[PDB]
Ligand SMILES: [Cu+]
Ligand SMILES: [Cu+]
Ligand SMILES: [Cu+]
Ligand SMILES: [Cu+]
Ligand SMILES: [Cu+]
Ligand SMILES: [Cu+]
Ligand SMILES: [Cu+]
Ligand SMILES: [Cu+]
Ligand SMILES: [Cu+]
Ligand SMILES: [Cu+]
Ligand SMILES: [Cu+]
Ligand SMILES: [Cu+]
Ligand SMILES: [Cu+]
Ligand SMILES: [Cu+]
Ligand SMILES: [Cu+]
Ligand SMILES: [Cu+]
Ligand SMILES: [Cu+]
Ligand SMILES: [Cu+]
Ligand SMILES: [Cu+]
Ligand SMILES: [Cu+]
Ligand SMILES: [Cu+]
Ligand SMILES: [Cu+]
Ligand SMILES: [Cu+]
Ligand SMILES: [Cu+]
Ligand SMILES: [Cu+]
Ligand SMILES: [Cu+]
Ligand SMILES: [Cu+]
Ligand SMILES: [Cu+]
Ligand SMILES: [Cu+]
Ligand SMILES: [Cu+]
Ligand SMILES: [Cu+]
Ligand SMILES: [Cu+]
Ligand SMILES: [Cu+]
């Protein structure tokens with residue numbers, strides 16, 4: 121905060137919550153496929169991307185005693201995992217609608233994290 | 242799942258994520274008030290309501306090997322905490338806009354949990 | 363708090379953290395089995411039991427403006443899910459060491475939750 | 484995984500769970516001090532360090548489709564926040580025992596993250 125883009129922050133928080141949920145729902149949807157054995161990296165990466173988006177949403181929602189070093193590090197982590205997860209689910213976009221929808225959510229939240237991170241100094 | 246209201250489920254998941262975030266933001270907004278000393282139960286209850294809504298959103302987002310006993314217990318917990326937190330922040334609705342907004346989110350998600358729980362058998 | 367068993371509380375918090383981790387590790391260990399297709403309810407229940415134990419540990423770690431109604435509801439949820447997950451992984455105790463170890467952690471934390479819940483009035 | 488130090492990994496997971504809990508307990512203990520108004524950055528940083536340690540413990544507990552890029556990014560975030568939080572609570576080590584205990588937990592988990600991160604390539 122201070123010279124930050126408040127609208128870029130709100131987008132990042134909203135995209136994190138959306139993306140955590142998409143990833144949780146994708147993990148579960150894949151567990152239910154008969155194809156489950158071939159979708160285990162996707163499921164694992166989804167579990168991670170949901171955990172990190174959850175944490176990132178909470179970190180970014182707070183302004184008291186804001187420390188840009190913590191914020192940048194957390195946004196970096198979230199961008200890195202959303203990129204990994206985006207590609208991972210994108211692999212199954214032609215197999216399952218859940219994975220193409222989740223791939224879009226990862227990429228969208230990767231963009232939101234990157235956009236915010238850049239304007240943090 | 243099975244005879245469940247899919248739209249009541251989606252509302253519950255959306256309201257949980259909205260409410261977790263509102264509560265996290267309220268906790269932080271109160272930490273920043275000069276009035277902080279008088280707002281410590283509100284801050285604590287917000288932290289709890291954010292933790293439980295987070296968990297509830299994730300539990301309700303999953304359908305593989307669904308167990309209605311776990312689901313009902315988790316929805317019960319989330320309703321109970323949203324009721325407690327709703328009243329707690331509602332106390333400061335005439336002091337801070339963050340608390341009146343958060344009070345509405347708690348009550349809204351309390352309703353969503355109760356509505357879903359009722360149709361689970 | 364007030365007439366509560368402080369040692370029963372500490373056990374509950376410690377068992378929750380242990381159990382969240384055991385469940386996360388079990389979920390992942392099962393995703394890696396060649397048997398994964400037959401272990402999907404176990405994996406799902408593990409994900410839920412890790413989420414609820416995480417939340418319960420945090421709720422129980424807090425004493426400011428303690429509300430026994432929220433605490434009991436949250437402990438109830440955690441006991442219910444640990445019971446479900448205990449039985450679920452116990453099914454694979456003769457197939458995988460991870461599931462027999464995780465089954466013991468669920469049962470242990472089910473006991474800790476039940477013991478605490480009983481002395482809360 | 485592969486050329487990784489399995490004992491450094493277990494330490495990191497254990498220290499994260501310990502540290503998440505210490506931070507949650509410190510946040511709450513500070514909310515209860517009469518001194519609360521002067522301890523608001525400590526409380527905020529504790530909330531963040533608990534969220535990130537929670538996520539890090541879960542990420543590090545998983546081996547299926549392991550991606551060292553995600554793992555390093557997440558460990559980096561966790562080290563950065565534990566360093567920030569260590570110093571933040573260390574400021575009140577002569578005021579409250581909870582803050583000196585929590586400061587030690589942050590520093591300990593900062594070390595565990597840094598040690599692991601270094602051997603990941
Ligand atoms: Cu975000
Ligand atoms: Cu995200
Ligand atoms: Cu996601
Ligand atoms: Cu999926
Ligand atoms: Cu998948
Ligand atoms: Cu994902
Ligand atoms: Cu994510
Ligand atoms: Cu994120
Ligand atoms: Cu992300
Ligand atoms: Cu993904
Ligand atoms: Cu996929
Ligand atoms: Cu996926
Ligand atoms: Cu999917
Ligand atoms: Cu898929
Ligand atoms: Cu995704
Ligand atoms: Cu995904
Ligand atoms: Cu993602
Ligand atoms: Cu994402
Ligand atoms: Cu993001
Ligand atoms: Cu972001
Ligand atoms: Cu909900
Ligand atoms: Cu909620
Ligand atoms: Cu809320
Ligand atoms: Cu507030
Ligand atoms: Cu408040
Ligand atoms: Cu709340
Ligand atoms: Cu809530
Ligand atoms: Cu909820
Ligand atoms: Cu709730
Ligand atoms: Cu509230
Ligand atoms: Cu309030
Ligand atoms: Cu509040
Ligand atoms: Cu507020």
Ligand SMILES: [Cu+]
Pocket residue numbers: 271280333334336337339340
């Ligand atoms: Cu307020």
Ligand SMILES: [Cu+]
Pocket residue numbers: 263264267326327330342343344345346347348
């Ligand atoms: Cu609220």
Ligand SMILES: [Cu+]
Pocket residue numbers: 263264267268287326327330340343344347
């Ligand atoms: Cu609130």
Ligand SMILES: [Cu+]
Pocket residue numbers: 260264287290291322323326327346347
């Ligand atoms: Cu609430």
Ligand SMILES: [Cu+]
Pocket residue numbers: 260261290294322323326346347348350351
């Ligand atoms: Cu709520």
Ligand SMILES: [Cu+]
Pocket residue numbers: 253256257319320323349350351352353354355
């Ligand atoms: Cu709700």
Ligand SMILES: [Cu+]
Pocket residue numbers: 253254257297316319350353354355357
């Ligand atoms: Cu709900």
Ligand SMILES: [Cu+]
Pocket residue numbers: 373374375376377378379418419422474475
């Ligand atoms: Cu517990």
Ligand SMILES: [Cu+]
Pocket residue numbers: 377378379381382415440444471472
């Ligand atoms: Cu537990």
Ligand SMILES: [Cu+]
Pocket residue numbers: 380381382383384385386411412415467468
């Ligand atoms: Cu467990």
Ligand SMILES: [Cu+]
Pocket residue numbers: 387388389390391392393404405408460461
């Ligand atoms: Cu397992």
Ligand SMILES: [Cu+]
Pocket residue numbers: 388389392401404405451454461
């Ligand atoms: Cu399993």
Ligand SMILES: [Cu+]
Pocket residue numbers: 384385407408409411412447448451464468
């Ligand atoms: Cu479990």
Ligand SMILES: [Cu+]
Pocket residue numbers: 381382385410411412413414415443444
């Ligand atoms: Cu559990």
Ligand SMILES: [Cu+]
Pocket residue numbers: 377378414415416418419440441471475
């Ligand atoms: Cu628990």
Ligand SMILES: [Cu+]
Pocket residue numbers: 414415439440441442443444471472475
């Ligand atoms: Cu439990």
